[PDB]
Design a protein around this ligand. Structure first.
Ligand SMILES: [K+]
Ligand SMILES: [K+]
Lengths: 288, 289
C-alpha cells in the first residue's frame, strides 16, 4: 500500500480570525489535542510511514510539534504526570514528518503539487488527508486501498448526504460496482441545487492519488489550481477513479461551529469532562 | 486611576497538553478570539494605556499577536471581509504592549515582580489580570478603582461561592464595610475544607496593587517561588489597606478544557453565526452517550 501521506495545511483558516493571525489552524485543540495530530494518527493507522505537511513559512511551528520535547518530557516524568507524558510522546513517535514550505496559499491543488519534490521512487500512490475533515472511526484510507488494489488508478471519498442537504458540496456523478460503498467516478458537480445533484455522494477530504495527479496538476489552467480539475483531466484521459462511501461519523473543523460540535462530542465521551459538561449543557441550552 | 495592566502568562497550561507544547495557552480561541485579547480588551475598557505581558522566551509569539498584519489586512479588505478586518485590527489598536521575560515559571508572585522593570514613575498602582479568569461583564477593575480611591492601598477580587463548593480556592478572612460588595481583607486561607472556610469569598484573578507590593515581594522568603499572598499578608501586617470587591456577575474558567469549552459554548450560543445550529445539535447530542 501507500507509505506517504500528504496533509495540505497552507490556508490561514479565515473563519477562526483573529486567532489564526498567530496560531496555525491545524494546531487548534479539539478538547486538548490538535487536528494535525488526529489526522497524523489516522494516516499512521492506515500504514503511512511518512507525513508531508504542506504549509506556509509562518506555520512552521507545526513542524516543531512533531519533534521530541526533552525538557518538558523530563519535567512531566519528575512530576509523575505519566498520562500527560504519554500524550506529548504520541505525535513525535507516529511517523517520519517532512514540511514542504509553500510561499503563498494558492489552494488545495497547488498545495498537493508542492508535495511532489518530497516523493520518491516507492511513492506510486499518495494519501491526502484534509485536516478540517475528521472521518470516524479510523480506516477510510484502508478501504480506499482495497479499491486501489482491485482497480488501480485513484480513489476518492464521499459522505452519503440527502440531495436537499448537499448543495454546499461537490457531488459525484457515478456508476455502480459490485460493492455498494464503491462507485466509479464519471465527474463532479460543484454545489448543485438538490434537483441537479447527480447523486447523494458528497466529496470528502480523503484521497489516494496515483502519481499521475502531478502531471495532471501541471496541465490544468489556473483560475488557483483546483484539484477537482486535475482529477477531471485524469478521468478524461482514461485514468480509473473510484470513490468509497464513508458510512460512519464525521466532523467538520472548517468553522468554529463545526469545531465546537467536534470538541463537545469528544469531551462528552471523556470521563475527565463528560458528566459535568453534560449537566452544564442541559441547563445552558434551556436559556438564551 | 491605573495606566499599566500586567498579564501573568508564564505557565505552560499543562492541562491543555499536548497542544500547549506548541501553542501558548493564552492564544487558544474562545470561539474565534484568544483569551489574551479578551483580557487586553477588559484592561483597556478599565482605562489601561499599557499592557505588560509576563511570559517565557518560548511564548514571545503572544507579543506578535499585538502587532499589525498589513498583508492580511489588505487581503481581507480586497475580499470585502470588513468584519474580519475589524476583528484583526482590534487587538493591535487596544493599547501599548510590552513583554517581560521570565526564563522560569516560578509562579504568580515571581511573574508580577518581573514586571517591575517595565513600570515608570507614574505607576503608583498596577492592575493584574489572570488570563484564565473571565469576569463578566467588563467592569470589575473600575469597581476596584473606586475602593482604591476611598481607602487607598490595594484591592483584590472575589467570587461569592457556597462553602460546600469553595475548597479549590483561596478564601478570604474579612470584615464588613458600608458596601455589601466590599470587604476589608484580614487574611486568606488556602483550600480550606467547607467547615474551616472563613467566608464565602473565593480569590478571583483580578488585582489593583499599590507599588508597595514590589518591596513586599523583595522582602518575603522564597520557596525561588514568590507567593503573592505572602507579599499581600506582609503588607496587611504592616498596615497597608487591602480590600476585596465581590463580583456579582458571571465568570468563566479557562484553566482546563472543561471550563474552556463551557466558555466557548456560552459565547457561541449568543452568536447568530453559530448559536441556533449549535443549540439544535446540542439538544440531540446530550440525549445520547
Ligand atoms: K496525544
Ligand atoms: K468536504
Amino acid at each position: 500500500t501507500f507509505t506517504t501521506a500528504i496533509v495540505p495545511a497552507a490556508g490561514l483558516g479565515t473563519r477562526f480570525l483573529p486567532t489564526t493571525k498567530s496560531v496555525p489552524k491545524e494546531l487548534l485543540p479539539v478538547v486538548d489535542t490538535p487536528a494535525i495530530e488526529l489526522v497524523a494518527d489516522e494516516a499512521r493507522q492506515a500504514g503511512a510511514e511518512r507525513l508531508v505537511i504542506v504549509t506556509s513559512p509562518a506555520k512552521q511551528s507545526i513542524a516543531a510539534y512533531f519533534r521530541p520535547a526533552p525538557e518538558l518530557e523530563r519535567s512531566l516524568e519528575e512530576k509523575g504526570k505519566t498520562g500527560q507524558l504519554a500524550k506529548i510522546r504520541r505525535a513525535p513517535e507516529l511517523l517520519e514528518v517532512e514540511v514542504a514550505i509553500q510561499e503563498q496559499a494558492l489552494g488545495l491543488g497547488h498545495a498537493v503539487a508542492c508535495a511532489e519534490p518530497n516523493l520518491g521512487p516507492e511513492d506510486d500512490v499518495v494519501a491526502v488527508l484534509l485536516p478540517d475533515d475528521l472521518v470516524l472511526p479510523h480506516g477510510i484510507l484502508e478501504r480506499m486501498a482495497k479499491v486501489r488494489a482491485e482497480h488501480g488508478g485513484s480513489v476518492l471519498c464521499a459522505f452519503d448526504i440527502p440531495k436537499e442537504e448537499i448543495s454546499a458540496y461537490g457531488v459525484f456523478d457515478v456508476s455502480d460496482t459490485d460493492d455498494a460503498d464503491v462507485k466509479r467516478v464519471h465527474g463532479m458537480v460543484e454545489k448543485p441545487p438538490a434537483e441537479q445533484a447527480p447523486s447523494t455522494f458528497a466529496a470528502a477530504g480523503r484521497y489516494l492519488l496515483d502519481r499521475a495527479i502531478f502531471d495532471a496538476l501541471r496541465r490544468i489552467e489556473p483560475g488557483e489550481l483546483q484539484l477537482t480539475d486535475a482529477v477531471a483531466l485524469l478521468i478524461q484521459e482514461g485514468h480509473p477513479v473510484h470513490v468509497v462511501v464513508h458510512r460512519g461519523d464525521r466532523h467538520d473543523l472548517g468553522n468554529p461551529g463545526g469545531f465546537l460540535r467536534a470538541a463537545v462530542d469528544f469531551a462528552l465521551q471523556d470521563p475527565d469532562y463528560g458528566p459535568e459538561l453534560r449537566a452544564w449543557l442541559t441547563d445552558r441550552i434551556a436559556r438564551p
